[PDB]
């Protein structure tokens, strides 16, 4: 599936915007994951990090998660615990893909864990770069 000529395939980490101004992280999935129907021509099914719901989104409107600082929004991050949770799960998936590790201490909070993950992302996901995030 997803041979319509456009960007993104199954497993790719993406930012999507479906309403208002906010970009949220997601992973492209098979239509089968959704228990809906095959995606319309030009579109991808994505599964949102955090809530795990599904949306059909134009391939031309999605952006790679690797374009990170461009689409991350610190204001929304500080406003919404739902966004903080979304970013954690998204960057955790990224981190495991890249074989990256960060120091941790017993007692660490969601924000404690996110701090080194955000620094890694904003920094261009070194050492792997964006290639580390591929399925």
Curated annotation (Swiss-Prot):
Sumoylated. It is found in: Nucleus. Residues 10-68 form the PWWP domain. It is linked to Immunodeficiency-centromeric instability-facial anomalies syndrome 1: A rare disorder characterized by a variable immunodeficiency resulting in recurrent infections, facial anomalies, and branching of chromosomes 1, 9, and 16. Other variable symptoms include growth retardation, failure to thrive, and psychomotor retardation. Laboratory studies show limited hypomethylation of DNA in a small fraction of the genome in some, but not all, patients. Required for genome-wide de novo methylation and is essential for the establishment of DNA methylation patterns during development. DNA methylation is coordinated with methylation of histones. May preferentially methylates nucleosomal DNA within the nucleosome core region. May function as transcriptional co-repressor by associating with CBX4 and independently of DNA methylation. Seems to be involved in gene silencing. Interacts with BAZ2A/TIP5, SUV39H1 and CBX4. Interacts with UHRF1. Interacts with DNMT1 and DNMT3A, SETDB1, UBL1, UBE2I9 and ZHX1. Interacts with the PRC2/EED-EZH2 complex. This is DNA (cytosine-5)-methyltransferase 3B. It comes from Homo sapiens. The chain holds residues 216 to 350 of 853 of the full protein.
């Amino acid at each position: 599936e997803y041979q319509d000529g456009k960007e993104f395939g199954i497993g790719d980490l993406v930012w999507g915007k479906i309403k208002g101004f906010s970009w949220w992280p997601a992973m492209v999935v098979s239509w089968k994951a959704t228990s809906k129907r095959q995606a319309m021509s030009g579109m991808r099914w994505v599964q949102w990090f955090g809530d795990g719901k599904f949306s059909e989104v134009s391939a031309d409107k999605l952006v790679a998660l690797g374009l990170f600082s461009q689409h991350f929004n610190l204001a929304t991050f500080n406003k919404l615990v739902s966004y903080r949770k979304a970013m954690y799960h998204a960057l955790e998936k990224a981190r495991v893909r890249a074989g990256k590790t960060f120091p941790s201490s017993p007692g660490d909070s969601l924000e404690d864990q996110l701090k080194p993950m955000l620094e890694w992302a904003h920094g261009g996901f070194k050492p792997t770069g964006i290639e580390g995030l591929k399925p």
